[PDB]
Amino acid sequence: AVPFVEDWDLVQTLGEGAYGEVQLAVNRVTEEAVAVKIVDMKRAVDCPENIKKEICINKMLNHENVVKFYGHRREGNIQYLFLEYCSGGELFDRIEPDIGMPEPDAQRFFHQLMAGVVYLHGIGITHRDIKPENLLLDERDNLKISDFGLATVFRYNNRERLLNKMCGTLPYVAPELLKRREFHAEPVDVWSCGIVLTAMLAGELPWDQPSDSCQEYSDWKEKKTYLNPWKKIDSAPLALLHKILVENPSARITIPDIKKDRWYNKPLKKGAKRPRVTS
Ligand SMILES: Cc1cc2n[nH]c(=O)n2c2ccccc12
């Protein structure tokens, strides 16, 4: 038993909002860095059950494109969740306003996003709030899906549950959440992935929300792709976006078909530069 190995110094606030905050923690002995999510359960009446569910869902997860859950500790009314530290920060901060990022970089992030979402959906979990703020990067820019506070089970014992809870973030949310009482979970996550791809390639969000009252959304359904953000996006990825951002969730492209898409499969991005010399 090595003394002090269970001691962590909190050295930097990584993020902070409703739940509480996430701190960078550094091990006193080993100097290993992890993220610690600190949740004061007295802050809200529903917080005890909310954080319980988040912990429950996290214990189900193990994938290279999902933020790793190391465990949790309660002391009185404070919950401490130990999570993978992602030193590259949020994907949000790699999207340049009005520009986006190089298309090969966006393609790589999108491959990894799909890997993460396929995994989650495979074990019957929907995230329900996919957006660049909730996609973190490690030291090699590998993407990790973050924050399972709004996540839920949509498939259990091989039987699908239809959802009805209005949740997410309006510019990322699928139109069926605003129009229908019930909806399938998976196309909702597919839609938000499409808005994420749009942001990565154009540095802007296409609409405030996907309703006919929103002129920008109306323009998209009328195929006015000579307007922004769409005019900034090359034809191959735009063709994929035309298949994802389809109003009818039943006609919307599925992830197995996204994986067969021409742009998805285009060679664009070189592997990370590795040390070399010449003679
Ligand atoms: C910036 C950042 C790094 C991180 N690594 N692991 C995590 O949970 N986070 C975060 C969680 C919330 C907000 C920011 C972060």
Side-chain angles (χ1 to χ4, degrees), residues 1-41 44-45 47-51 53-139 141-272 274-275 277-279:
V2 178
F4 318 135
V5 74
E6 293 181 339
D7 290 324
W8 305 76
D9 301 315
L10 303 182
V11 301
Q12 173 181 157
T13 300
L14 293 174
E16 51 178 1
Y19 58 93
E21 73 190 67
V22 178
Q23 283 286 320
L24 175 53
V26 178
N27 190 276
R28 172 175 169 185
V29 176
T30 70
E31 302 190 53
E32 184 188 354
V34 302
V36 176
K37 187 170 197 169
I38 301 160
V39 183
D40 180 8
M41 298 188 290
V45 180
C47 182
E49 81 188 297
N50 280 352
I51 194 57
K53 190 176 186 197
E54 174 167 352
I55 290 164
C56 202
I57 287 182
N58 267 288
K59 298 196 297 178
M60 302 171 65
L61 312 177
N62 176 33
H63 191 268
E64 60 265 35
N65 298 117
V66 174
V67 166
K68 194 167 180 194
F69 178 72
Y70 299 128
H72 78 106
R73 203 186 83 96
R74 183 180 66 75
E75 44 158 62
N77 298 296
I78 310 307
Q79 279 287 4
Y80 293 91
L81 283 67
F82 289 76
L83 305 167
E84 182 179 357
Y85 173 53
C86 296
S87 60
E90 296 178 10
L91 181 66
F92 185 94
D93 298 323
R94 310 300 184 87
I95 302 171
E96 181 178 357
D98 276 289
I99 288 285
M101 73 181 60
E103 189 184 309
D105 294 43
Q107 195 207 46
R108 176 176 175 278
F109 290 140
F110 193 77
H111 288 161
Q112 294 180 4
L113 177 55
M114 288 299 101
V117 173
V118 165
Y119 170 73
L120 295 176
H121 291 177
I123 63 163
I125 302 303
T126 178
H127 184 275
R128 301 205 287 186
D129 202 18
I130 299 174
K131 53 180 179 180
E133 297 92 325
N134 282 336
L135 304 170
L136 301 184
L137 300 175
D138 77 3
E139 70 290 344
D141 281 358
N142 295 125
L143 167 154
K144 320 262 170 168
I145 298 172
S146 171
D147 197 331
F148 291 85
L150 282 174
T152 203
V153 180
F154 74 93
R155 197 200 304 108
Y156 198 79
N157 292 337
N158 198 230
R159 283 295 290 177
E160 195 185 354
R161 282 123 199 269
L162 301 175
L163 307 178
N164 61 252
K165 180 185 206 302
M166 279 184 77
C167 59
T169 300
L170 275 168
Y172 302 90
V173 86
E176 61 270 23
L177 273 78
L178 304 183
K179 300 190 87 135
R180 310 302 187 177
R181 189 178 70 76
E182 298 183 292
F183 40 88
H184 291 278
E186 291 168 284
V188 178
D189 285 335
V190 168
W191 180 279
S192 56
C193 290
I195 303 296
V196 168
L197 179 54
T198 303
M200 289 197 297
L201 295 173
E204 74 182 302
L205 293 171
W207 40 71
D208 289 348
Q209 51 181 63
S211 62
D212 292 321
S213 63
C214 192
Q215 183 62 48
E216 291 74 26
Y217 183 62
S218 196
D219 290 345
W220 170 252
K221 286 198 291 176
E222 288 173 357
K223 303 198 169 182
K224 301 186 184 186
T225 54
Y226 55 82
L227 300 169
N228 283 338
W230 318 114
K231 58 175 151 203
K232 295 189 264 187
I233 302 174
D234 207 1
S235 66
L238 188 54
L240 173 59
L241 290 171
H242 270 112
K243 294 181 292 192
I244 298 183
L245 303 174
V246 161
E247 184 180 65
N248 182 359
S250 294
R252 192 171 308 151
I253 194 170
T254 62
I255 298 174
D257 289 333
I258 290 173
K259 283 170 160 204
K260 297 186 303 200
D261 170 79
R262 187 172 61 83
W263 179 75
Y264 193 91
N265 284 282
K266 190 183 283 205
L268 294 177
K269 176 68 165 154
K270 299 290 195 191
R274 306 191 183 191
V277 303
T278 67
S279 55

